[PDB]
């Protein structure tokens, strides 16, 4: 009889990976839209335009990128072009930069680069878990680095794709850090600690993350005490960019085996 459960397993794993594969392309496609939008800002910001047009550009960049929660502009030789725009249910512009190590890193890397996830205190006093995306600004003939573009992407804003009306997905960053899960208390914590009761399963997932592969496996969930089918799939979180910092993110999809078997 159990060969029936075995076919049910075969069929469930197939659709998990197809389902998971879509979720990855969806999230990565969203990140790609933002990077594409950033490259346009990058191109226009340093052109011979007046301040208000540059502000006009940063505001519209936030408006059209719902997952962007902030953007900063820095210019070496123009004081009035050192601004930070943070999402405050609208946009709040704060004048300022220069000593910011993110602006300095942006100007020393030709390719799009990143920081690591972190909590930013927002104008309304709330904490937003996110990550910074960096680009350099170049003058007309591309000869000189003249400024920096710094984009704060909200990881919490991906709740729409990961946790809205479902609880079977995790977003995992480098070193196996949980970036977003339905279990809010897991954010910013490593899976080696969360799931230390299944070190063989976690060590495979972490290996799959480091190598940029994909896989399916089983594990006993320590929270539900039920065995889950688990599908993982990594993806380059900076997109098509060839960059030192274009590392692997991972999305996990779980299905408790009991629901399949009947």
Chain residues that interact with Ca ion, rule: CB under 5 A: 18-19
Residues of span 173-232 touching Cl ion by CB under 5 A = 173-174
Q: Which of 44, 94, 116, 220 binds its own copies (CB under 8 A)?
A: 44
Q: List the single partner that 181 binds among Zn ion, its own copies, Cl ion, none, CB under 5 to 8 Å by kind.
A: none
Residues 164, 17, 153: CA angle, nearest 5 degrees: 45
Kindly state the smallest distance separating residue 2's Cβ from Zn ion, in Å.
11
* Residue whose C-alpha is closest to residue 99's, from 133, 148, 135, 143: 148
Q: Binding residues for Cl ion, how many (CB under 5 A)?
A: 2
Which of Cl ion, its own copies, Zn ion, none has residue 258 at its interface (CB below 5 to 8 Å by kind)? Zn ion
- Indicate whether 160 belongs to the interface with its own copies (CB under 8 A): no
Stretch that binds its own copies, among 13-21, 106-114, 175-183, 187-195 (CB under 8 A): 13-21
When asked if residue 167 is in the footprint of its own copies (CB under 8 A), the reply is no
Q: Which residues of 108-121 are buried (b: 16+ CB within 10 A; e: fewer)?
A: eeeebbbbebeebe
Contact 229, 255 (CB under 8 A): yes
State yes or no: residue 36 binds its own copies (CB under 8 A): yes
DSSP letter assigned to residue 81: G
| Dihedral sign of CA atoms 150, 103, 85, 174 in order | positive
- Nearer to its own copies by C-beta: 191 or 251? 251
By CB under 8 A, residue 21 contacts its own copies: yes
Q: Which stretch binds its own copies (CB under 8 A): 31-39, 117-125, 152-160, 181-189?
A: 31-39
Q: What are 40-47's contacts with CB under 8 Å, separation 24+? A: 41/71, 41/149, 42/135, 42/136, 42/137, 42/149, 45/73, 45/137, 45/147, 45/149, 46/75, 46/137, 46/138, 46/139, 46/140, 46/146, 46/147, 47/140
Report if residue 66 touches its own copies, rule: CB under 8 A.
yes
Report in angstroms how near the CB of residue 245 gets to Cl ion at its nearest: 9
Q: Which is nearer to Cl ion, 174 or 260 (CB)?
A: 174
Burial 184-218 (b: 16+ CB within 10 A, else e): eebbeebbeebbeebeebbebbbebbeeeebebbe
Minimum distance from CB of 241 to Cl ion (Å)? 14
- Residue ranges in contact with Cl ion by CB under 5 A: 173-174
- Residue ranges in contact with its own copies by CB under 8 A: 4, 7-8, 11-12, 14-15, 18-19, 21-23, 25-26, 29-30, 32-33, 36-37, 39-40, 43-44, 47, 49, 53, 56-57, 60, 64, 66, 240, 262
């Amino acid at each position: 009889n159990s060969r029936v459960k075995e076919i049910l397993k075969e069929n469930t794993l197939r659709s998990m990976q197809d389902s998971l594969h879509f979720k990855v392309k969806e999230v990565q496609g969203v990140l790609e839209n933002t990077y594409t939008s950033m490259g346009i800002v990058k191109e226009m910001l340093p052109k011979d335009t007046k301040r208000e047009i540059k502000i006009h550009l940063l505001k519209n960049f936030i408006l059209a990128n719902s997952h962007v929660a902030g953007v900063s502009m820095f210019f070496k030789n123009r004081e009035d072009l050192r601004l930070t725009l943070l999402r405050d249910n609208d946009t709040i512009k704060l004048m300022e930069l220069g000593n910011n190590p993110l602006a300095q890193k942006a100007m020393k890397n030709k390719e799009i680069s990143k920081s690591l996830p972190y909590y930013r205190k927002m104008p309304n006093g709330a904490e937003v878990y996110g990550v910074d995306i960096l680009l350099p600004l170049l003058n007309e003939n591309a000869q000189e680095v003249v400024g920096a573009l710094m984009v704060f992407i909200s990881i919490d804003s991906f709740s729409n794709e990961i946790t809205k009306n479902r609880s079977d997905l995790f977003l995992i960053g480098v070193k196996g850090k949980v970036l977003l899960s339905a279990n809010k208390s897991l954010q910013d914590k490593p899976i080696a600690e969360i799931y230390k009761s299944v070190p063989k399963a976690t060590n495979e997932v972490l290996t799959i993350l480091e190598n940029g592969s994909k896989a399916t496996l089983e594990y006993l969930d320590p929270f539900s005490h039920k065995e889950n089918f688990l599908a993982v799939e990594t993806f380059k979180m900076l997109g098509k960019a060839e960059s030192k910092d274009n590392l692997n993110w991972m999305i996990a999809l779980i299905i408790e085996k009991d629901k399949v078997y009947e």
